[PDB]
């Protein structure tokens, strides 16, 4: 890659996003970092579930089917107790639908008591339905976002969910040179991609489920493509640098300049015109 090209003498400088590692720094001389960007996880933002039509779906349609049968049975019992059955049926149907027609004229006082009791039962059923709706409502956004490497879903992987980074990158070095995630590294080694853009396209096309990459790149990708979002707290926070060979005369002058541009506000203007220029 770039490090090999620079070491071989084919190049004299690496002006590109090159994360400052230890293995890289052992052979080449990094300048002062012109940016600070840790690693984050790019994931696809699932569309919110705006049903607005789950009426008989939430609990069980059999309850809605049995409600009418129970109402008819209660009406029949009221008719037999009265010994205008159609008028009483309409009145009950209006009461269970808050119509308030007022066409019900029970004969006996027991019929009146049963009618009042029925209304109370209906009120209770309505309350139960409202509670169920609240449970479904409050239970919105069931899916959560994995919180970086510390999340248990990443420490223990699975074939169903795959999270793979980019081959021949500092990231791979970070996973390899830290023996606390050997399972994660083994899982990621079977899904690495040729280039970052290919991984972005695969993630957006549901080919992957998570991407591990620099914050400076993933944040811009999320800003550009609203279909994707970035999650996970910044980890391995080490910025890019102008990699170049140790035995070079520019080492004492590039870095200072990068400092000056970092303090004169030039890098802030570059970020505004190239990274921070849009949102979603």
């Amino acid at each position: 890659g770039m490090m090999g090209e620079l070491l071989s003498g084919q190049a004299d400088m690496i002006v590109a996003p090159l994360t400052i590692n230890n293995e890289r720094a052992q052979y080449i001389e990094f300048s002062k970092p012109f940016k600070y960007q840790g690693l984050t996880i790019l994931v696809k933002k699932e569309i919110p579930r705006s049903t607005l039509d789950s009426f008989m779906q939430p609990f069980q349609s059999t309850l809605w089917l049995l409600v009418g049968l129970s109402v008819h049975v209660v009406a029949v019992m009221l008719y037999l107790l009265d010994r205008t059955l159609s008028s009483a049926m309409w009145f009950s149907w209006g009461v269970l639908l808050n119509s308030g027609i007022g066409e019900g004229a029970p004969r006996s006082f027991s019929a009146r008591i049963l009618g009042m009791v029925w209304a109370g039962f209906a009120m209770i059923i309505v309350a139960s339905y409202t509670a169920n709706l609240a449970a479904f409502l409050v239970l919105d956004r069931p899916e959560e976002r994995i919180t970086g490497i510390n999340d248990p879903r990443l420490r223990n992987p699975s074939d169903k969910f795959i999270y793979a980074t980019v081959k021949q990158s500092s990231v791979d070095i970070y996973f390899r040179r830290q023996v606390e995630l050997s399972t994660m590294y083994r899982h990621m080694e079977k899904h690495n991609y040729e280039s970052a853009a290919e991984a972005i396209q695969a993630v957006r096309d549901n080919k992957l489920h998570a991407f591990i990459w620099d914050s400076a790149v993933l944040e811009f990708e999320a800003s550009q493509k609203c279909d994707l979002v970035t999650t996970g707290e910044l980890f391995f926070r080490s910025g890019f640098g102008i990699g170049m060979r140790k035995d070079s005369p520019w080492k004492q002058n590039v870095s200072l300049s990068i400092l000056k541009s970092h303090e004169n506000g030039f890098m802030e203007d570059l970020d505004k015109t190239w990274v921070r220029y849009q949102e979603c």
Partner: protein, 50 residues
């Protein structure tokens, strides 16, 4: 601190010492280990305004 480092009184200055383009032109020192900068602080206890 920087003055003591320049005049060979001390060979190392570990502490809260921000990297600058003026200090680097005098003392050459290692890569940053804490990301810092310039920030503004203000109190918001006057009103929640939720």
């Amino acid at each position: 601190m920087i003055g003591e480092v320049v005049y060979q009184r001390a060979v190392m200055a570990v502490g809260s010492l921000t990297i600058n383009e003026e200090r680097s032109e005098v003392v050459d020192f290692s890569v940053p280990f804490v990301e810092t900068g310039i920030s503004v602080m203000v109190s918001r206890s006057n009103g929640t305004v939720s």
